[PDB]
Structure formats: structure tokens, C-alpha cells
Amino acid sequence: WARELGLIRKPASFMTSICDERGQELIYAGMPITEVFKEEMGIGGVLGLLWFQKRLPKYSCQFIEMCLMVTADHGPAVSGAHNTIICARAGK
Amino acid sequence: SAKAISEQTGKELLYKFICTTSAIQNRFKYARVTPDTDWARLLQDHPWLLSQNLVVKPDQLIKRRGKLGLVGVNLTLDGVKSWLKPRLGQEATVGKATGFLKNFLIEPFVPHSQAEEFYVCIYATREGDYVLFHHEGGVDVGDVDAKAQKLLVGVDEKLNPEDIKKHLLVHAPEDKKEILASFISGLFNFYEDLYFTYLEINPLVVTKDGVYVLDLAAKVDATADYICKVKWGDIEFPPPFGREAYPEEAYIADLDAKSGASLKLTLLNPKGRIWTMVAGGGASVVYSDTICDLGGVNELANYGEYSGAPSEQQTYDYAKTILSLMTREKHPDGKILIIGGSIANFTNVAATFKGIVRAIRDYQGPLKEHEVTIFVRRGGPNYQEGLRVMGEVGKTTGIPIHVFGTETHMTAIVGMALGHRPIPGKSTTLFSRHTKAIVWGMQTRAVQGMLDFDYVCSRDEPSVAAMVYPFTGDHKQKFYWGHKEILIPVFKNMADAMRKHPEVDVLINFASLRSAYDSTMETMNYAQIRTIAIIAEGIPEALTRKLIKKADQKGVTIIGPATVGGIKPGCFKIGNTGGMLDNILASKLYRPGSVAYVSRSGGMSNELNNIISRTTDGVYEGVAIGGDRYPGSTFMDHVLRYQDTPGVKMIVVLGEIGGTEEYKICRGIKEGRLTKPIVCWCIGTCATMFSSEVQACANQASETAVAKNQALKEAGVFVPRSFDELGEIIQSVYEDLVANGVIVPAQEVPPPTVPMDYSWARELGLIRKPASFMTSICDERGQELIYAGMPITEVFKEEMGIGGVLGLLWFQKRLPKYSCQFIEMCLMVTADHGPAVSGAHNTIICARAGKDLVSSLTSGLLTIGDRFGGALDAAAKMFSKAFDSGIIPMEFVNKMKKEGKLIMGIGHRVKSINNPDMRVQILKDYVRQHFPATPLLDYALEVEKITTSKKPNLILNVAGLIGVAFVDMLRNCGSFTREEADEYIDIGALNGIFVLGRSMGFIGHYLDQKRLKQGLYRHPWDDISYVLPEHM
Ligand SMILES: CC(C)(COP(=O)(O)OP(=O)(O)OC[C@H]1O[C@@H](n2cnc3c(N)ncnc32)[C@H](O)[C@@H]1OP(=O)(O)O)[C@@H](O)C(=O)NCCC(=O)NCCSC(=O)C[C@@](O)(CC(=O)O)C(=O)O
């Protein structure tokens, strides 16, 4: 109630610029989620907004999605997949 | 600060570090005699004593010994022994100083005449060093400044030999012209390499055999210790010859070196009743002058100050010292304690007053019967809380306490105490509303005060454009612009800051004394900077002179070192000037006035702020030039600035003792250069009433405050009778200037408001904010680290180890010693179980991925759960459930069997009955020997008897034993109730036991893989069965 009246000063300990949860609509780097779906960006456009705070061109978003697709998996023999499998088999 | 060194120290250091082609004789050839020493050792370590004739003189900072007959010349060793006895340890009187003798110096006699009596002197001035050579030196020197040849060596200039030959060696004999010149040159190099400010050898006798230094008086720049501690060694600075220093006075001197605060105390007569403990050097001088003016010269005991923002503990030390020294006598007439000073800019009045509060709480006894009345007059940061704290405490203990704020005159409490009154090119404009400054250093409180002042001054933009901090990368610091949040850039380098902010014209330098010189030199390489404020106190005077010379060359105005800075109401504030925002509002420093002032002190400058606000329109501009011997800018510089400023109408000058600086004002007002009204008061008129040379020091006779005050008076300067009359004379001059009509006061526009700080509102208890976190295991804050209510020193004294610390941190209990030992054993046996298990395997994989200790250990730890590492918890829970349900072990075995469940904690791969686990055995033996009761362990052993009857290897596991024994420890040691033990089992304390134990092994595996330099692991394809679908 003192903050609402503007009677006290308290510095904010955190800064953020990628997502605005508060308010009527969710916002991804200045862009409403309804506008995100209307403009038909997919994972690539959302990633551009959340990682770079930019509205990337469509080919950039498509390329980002393609990069995610080609690195999705490379079999169970590599170190990370091996560790994940070990942990899953530990019932974890 | 120049400090005189002993003759012995001066000659020793001179012999050790002079470098000349001249043949200097009697190197390290001297003997020190003191009353409390033997003589046989003195004979044995100095074989030169009997080799030739001797001369003895007291080395106790006494001059004019020849005119006073205190030297025994041309008399042998038995002569010096006979001559010491009437004087060694006896009373002596030189002028007004009376003191005993503890120090004498012995040196071989030098046969010489008046034909080779040579006087050499080097002393420091603002513009450089003067060398004086008198050919007819010695006692017959007479007038030296007018007859001895004088030569100036400027700042950053060399003393070259031909300069000595012509401008210094006209009257020297030709045969001795040459080598002496070389010597003189080397002497100058000795003078400036060891940071001497005064160095006179008189007489210096030179003959064909060589040169001989018979005498030398030397003052060295003490603040240069950090440069010359290697060359000086353990240099000592003798006190002036006179009364012996008190142990408490030496204590105060020792306190002065503890931190950057200034902690001074000096005595004249402890039998006096007037006792002043005044904050701020200027305020202390003013209070002493005020008490001496109205009849307290003889009855005043002490003179001293505490400033530079001393802490609570240091204030305790100073206050308990002053009370202990005050209690030495009973004065029937009564005793007073005058405490306070001016409004502080930086000194936390709250802490410095809690210090005296808690120093007088314990000193009620030995002073209440002394009839001590305490008069306080303090202002500054958090003064409204400290004043009323001390009022509460004084009323609680009952001693006479009179609490006065800033609404009263600073020296009115003096009149109350003594009963005289009832007790109730360089620019003209440095700063504007568009001035942008760079702050050198990480001073966020000062920058925020600057910004708050800018906001309440209705400035368009903040006055701080950037900060420079070399120990961090470039980033942005979050500050407040009123209630809005703004970002101010912080740069590692000056160059980037000046590149990105060409509109900055001011540098505020918060570098320490060791960094200020280099910071300021680097700053003056950027022509955009026209004004530099240097805050640091303790810069050596020679470095300051180099700064002054470069600033004069570059046309840069320097607000000299050892200053709080200055304030231009409505436009700009330097650093911490004017204190917090409440002081800014109270003195109405948010809007321009018409009176411009200059002073040396910052506390006196804030007092002037308050006075001028109370009696006139307000302050137009105030500058504190600092307490150094060579300020970057002088009184007369700022007075000239003010005269050329159409905004100012009257000029207040607050001078001090020593220095002929106000006489430049007199020559400017006696002539028509300075036309505006000037109200000047010089503090320190009590310096004459001091029977010593206490250091800000008067050198000549016209540099006393009385002479300067009278000289300004006859010059046309409005000089009050005293400081107490300064407010009224300023008021009268302003009133006449407003009756004439040159001053037209403006309408009081209310300033913008700044929201209160959250932390300050919480301290006042004005707001409520629920804490979002709860904790009960560790208290980091406070003087000592606390583990669940137990201090860390007590943790180590009680000799608990890892087990006791774990008990404290996990259960908040002081466990018995066997419990802590058992916990340690459990950690030891679960430390590792080889590299084949899932967690160790994952940790090794992650280590071989070149990853990280934390990452690898964490990768291994994330496998801890049901199938791996969870058997401890599972066994404890299963056995506890069976035991608490009341079923017998056979019923438990059958019930587990028909539920399709294996008993957790039963079973080994190879080991069986007659082939025991042997770490189950260690723990079981310990538990049997030390635990008071083990019901669950007995139950589990019965279960194990049944299961090993089924087949031999169905023994109690390490997991089973640790689980049941941990339950037994929790609920059978006296620390827990049954509910607490059950809760700790339920929330996973045994999971924590396994995790903490196995972390040791996982870290060991990480380090092992790093040491073996194992490369990236890939699982072989032949060990993987690929069962992908045909086509999805
Ligand atoms: C000048 C300064 C800011 C200097 O600051 P500090 O020295 O504290 O801090 P630092 O800059 O960090 O220097 C420390 C050195 O240790 C180094 N260091 C740090 N951490 C290190 C690590 N981990 N490892 C290695 N090294 C490390 C660091 O690098 C530095 O090294 P170096 O550069 O070589 O020095 C301060 O001291 C001072 O003088 N005044 C404060 C400001 C002010 O407003 N004054 C006027 C007050 S008006 C007054 O007096 C009247 C009165 O009192 C009257 C009354 O009472 O009424 C009143 O109030 O009105």
C-alpha cells in the first residue's frame, strides 16, 4: 500500500526483457501471443523473440527450426544420450 | 603533514642515502645516550669515542642551543660524562616550553673556524622548493631570508650544478666552490627522494679533508610513508619538547592510524573543568575559540576532534579515553562536557552517537559523583535518531543531558555551559544545471545523493553521466531518478567513459590517496574536463604540487584534495556535500540563493550552509577547498570567481590559522578588484593560548587568526567580533543589501518530492513487509557464524566433527558423541563403491566429456533415487513400518513374500553367513557397543536369521543396517521425539546420508578421470541393440 501510494522507494533486484507474464495477455518480447500465432511464426519465430528479442524474417525462423530438427538426436552411443539412458534405467 | 624528525634520524638517513662525489665523513658516526641505559656497551660498540675529541648535544627537537648554552663543545669523553649529570634527566626551559631530557647525541669534534661555517637549507613551498645557502653561516646567520642566497627549484624541475655555481655560489670560496656544489646537488636529491619538506644543515663544515654535517633540522612529509616506508625504516616523529605525552594521548594517536578517520586529542591541563569532544576539526577549533573568547582560557583542559566518519567502536575508544582522563580529579565547582559540532556531510551521526551512548552507560559510576553536565549540539546523517537515542539514554541514567538540534547556533551551547546565557584558462563558472560529471570509484551512495539533489533541484538530467571503476567490466548500475529507475554506465577505463560522454566537464575523484595522483594525471589528459574534485585525504604534498602545476598548465580547476567538495544549489553537488536529502531540504539547498562562501573544512561548510539558509536568501555556491597545505584552488581563486559571477551578491570566507591567503583578499579589497560585500572570519584565535606547537599550523607572526581578522577588518571586510557573531553580521549585510534593493529575494517554490527509501522506512518501523523465506539452520549475519543456534567457535571447541555439524545443520540438535561418530562412519562406508554403478558411471562419462567438477558430480548424483542409492531409505521405511505395526519377524517375512516384495536391506551378491560383509560388521559392532537401545536393529537381525535360514547370502545389507541403525539412533538418542524422528525419516534424511557419502566417491572419480586424462567416451555400437520400427 505504501508502494501504491508512491511513498517509498525500493530498487528492483531483477531485470528482464524477454517475456511479460503480467497483464491481460502473455507477451513475448513486446509481441502478444495472439499476434505470435496470427503472424504464423512457429518454434523459430518464438525462439527469435525469446532469445534475441527480434522479429526474425521467415527464412531465419525456418532455418532455426531446421537446425533444431537436424540436431534432435544422434543415437544412444554419445555421452549425453548414454547418461540420459543410464538415468532412465535407474528408474529416476 | 610535515613532521619533525630527530637529529639522529636525519643524519642517519642522510648518511645512508645521500649520493655525491664529495667525500662525506663521519658516516653512521654517532652515539645515542639516554638516562635508562648502561655505558659500557656504549663504549664497546663505538670505538671512536676515545679516538678523538667529542661533542654532546641534546637531541630532543630543541633549537637555539648555542644561544641557550645547552651544548658541550671541545670537551672530551670524561667531559661529556661530567657534563651530562647536571642536565641528563633534569628540568630544562626553552622559551615557554619546560621539559626534562631523555635523549643526547655524541659525535666526534670537528676542528673548524668561522671561515668555513656554511648554512644550507631546503624548504618546501607551493611553487617549489627554496634552497638557501649562507656563506657566513652558523650563529652569525642573522637574517637568512634576506642575506643567504635563495634559489627556487620549481615543481618537476631539476637542481642543476651551474645553477648552484652562479646563483648559489657567488660568495663561497673558490677552492670549495666545486665539491660543495656537487654535494648541494646530491643533497637536493636526498631532499626530494625521501619526501622531505624541511632540511637545514647549519653548520655544515667543509675542509680539504671532507664535508661534515654538524647539525640538521628536518621535517619530512609523513603522508609519504606508503612511498618511503622501505627507505625510512621504522622512522619516529618526536613530539615537541615539553610536557610528556599522556598514555591516553598516545592511545588516540594510535587510534588515528586504525582507519581513515581523524582522531586528535591534545592536553594543556587535565585539572581543568572544560572538556570538549567536538566532531570535525573546524568545529573543534571554533568551539575552543568560542570558549576562550568568553572567559575559559585557563579552565579549558583538552582540545581535539573526531572526524572522517569514525565508526561506533572508534567513538567508544575516544569517548572512554576522554572520560577516563576526565575522572582523574574532583572539581567541586563542577565539570562540563561539550559534545557535537557542525552538521556532518558523511559521518553517520547515529553510529557515532550510539558509541558515546554505550561508552557512558558503563561510565555512570566513576563520573556521576563528579558533577558532570553534558551539552550536545550535533547535526548530520541520521542526527534525528542519534540525538533522541542519546536523550533517552541520558534521561534513563539521569545525568544532566541537554539535547539540541540544528535549530540552535552551534556555539550557543558554549554560552549555556558557562552560564552567560540561559539554557532553553580556468573558468569562472564551474557548475551549471547542465553540468555532467564522471565519478571515479564505486561510490553508489554518493552518486545517489547527487541524483536526489539533482531531482529536488528540478534538473532536467542527472549530473552523473558515467562512473569509472577499474576493477570491473563495463556494465550499467541501477540508480533512482526521483521514483523512476535509471541506468548509469560504469566503465573500466577513463578513455571509454570520455569517448561515450563528451558532454562531461567535471570529474569527481573518489580514488584513495594511493590512486588519486595517477587518476588525476590521467584525467587531465582529456581537455573536456575543466574541474576535478579530489576527495582523498593524505596525499603527499609533493604529488599535490605536481597536480597543481599540471592543472595550472591545462587550465583545469581543482577542488583540492581532502575535501568533501562543494555545492551549487539548483545546479550541482559534489559527492557527499550537504549530507543527506533531509539536510538539503532543511537548508533549502535545492534553490539558488545570493551568498557565495569559501572555507577549508567540510563540516564548517555544512554549518555555513545551515547558517546562511537561516539568516539570508540562501547559498548561491559553496566551496570547501580542503585541509591540505597546498589546495588545488585557494580562497582567493574562488573569491575572484564569485566577484566575476553576477549571481552572487555577498561573499562569506571562513579562513583558518596559518598562511597569508586572506591578505590576498585584503589586497583585492583595499584595491578595487573585489567590490562585493565580503564577510570573513578566521578561526583559530586560540592558537596563541596554546603552550605548544600542536598541528593547519602557524609559521610566522602575521599568520595568526587575530592578525588576519584585524587586517581584513581595516581592509573593508565585514569581520564579526567572533564566530558566534558571524550569523548576525551576515544577516545584517544581507538585510542592507536587500534594503538597498540589489538583492530581490525570489518566491519560495516547493521542491519536487522524493519517495522515502525502503530500508530507511523499515529501520524506522514505518512499513510492514512480510518475509518470503524462512530458515532455521544457519545464521550468516552477525559477528559470528551460527550453526543452528551454536556459534562456530563453540562448534570447534566442543570438538564435534562432520557428524556434529551435520546434526546441527540437518536436525538442529546437539547429538551425543556416539551419534556423531556413527554418522561419520555411515558417510565413510558409503563414500564409494567402485566405478561400475550408475552414478559413478555417469560422473565418469561427464568427466571424460571434459566437462566440470560440479557438472560431473551432479550428473552422477541425478541417478540417486529408487533403483540406485535408495535402499537405505527404503530399508528404514520398510523395517520401521513392520516394527511399528507390531508383527513379529516371521510374519513380516511372510507378508513381504505374499506381496511380491523383496525385503529392502537383505541380500548380498557374494557374502553370506560365515562370510560377513565386514563393513556391516564394523557398523554393527559400533552400534552394539555405543547405542543405548537398538530395538529396530534387533528386529532386523531376527529377520536376517529367517532369511539366511532360507539361503545363506540373504544377510543384512549395508543399506539395511544403516537404515535400521539410523532409525534407532534417531528415536533412541535423547534428542528427538518419536514424531521428529519419523518426520526426518519421511522427508529423506537417509537419502541425504547416502548422497553426502557418495559425493566423496563421485568427486574422487572425477579427479581420477582428470588425472588419467581420459578422453571422450562413446559407447560401442556392438553393445547396443537397435530395434527401430520398419518405417514410421
Ligand atoms: C577517498 C575515499 C573515498 C577512499 O575510499 P576507500 O579507501 O575507503 O576505498 P577504495 O577506493 O576501495 O581503496 C582501498 C584500496 O584497497 C584496494 N582493495 C579493495 N579490495 C581489495 C582486494 N579484495 N584485494 C586487494 N585490494 C583491494 C582498493 O583497490 C584500494 O587500493 P588503492 O587504490 O591502492 O588505495 C575515502 O577513504 C575518504 O577519504 N572519504 C570518503 C568520501 C567523502 O565523502 N569524504 C569527505 C567526508 S566530509 C568530512 O570529513 C568532515 C566531517 O567528517 C565532519 C564531521 O564529522 O561532522 C563530515 O562528515 O562532515
Ligand SMILES: CC(C)(COP(=O)(O)OP(=O)(O)OC[C@H]1O[C@@H](n2cnc3c(N)ncnc32)[C@H](O)[C@@H]1OP(=O)(O)O)[C@@H](O)C(=O)NCCC(=O)NCCS
Ligand atoms: C569429426 C572428427 C571427429 C571425425 O573423426 P574420425 O576419427 O574421422 O571418426 P570418428 O571419431 O567418428 O570414429 C572413427 C571410427 O569409429 C567408428 N565409430 C563411431 N562411433 C562409434 C561407436 N559408438 N561404436 C563403435 N564405433 C564407432 C566410426 O564408424 C569410424 O569407423 P571407421 O574406423 O570404420 O571409419 C574429426 O574430423 C575431428 O575431430 N574434427 C574436428 C571438428 C569437429 O570436432 N567436428 C565435430 C563433429 S560434428
Ligand SMILES: Nc1ncnc2c1ncn2[C@@H]1O[C@H](COP(=O)(O)OP(=O)(O)O)[C@@H](O)[C@H]1O
Ligand atoms: N661535531 C662538532 N664539531 C665541532 N663543532 C661543533 C660540532 N657540533 C657543534 N659544534 C659547534 O656548535 C656550533 C653550532 O651550534 P648548533 O648545534 O648549530 O646550535 P643549535 O643546536 O641551536 O642549532 C658551531 O659553532 C660549532 O662550533
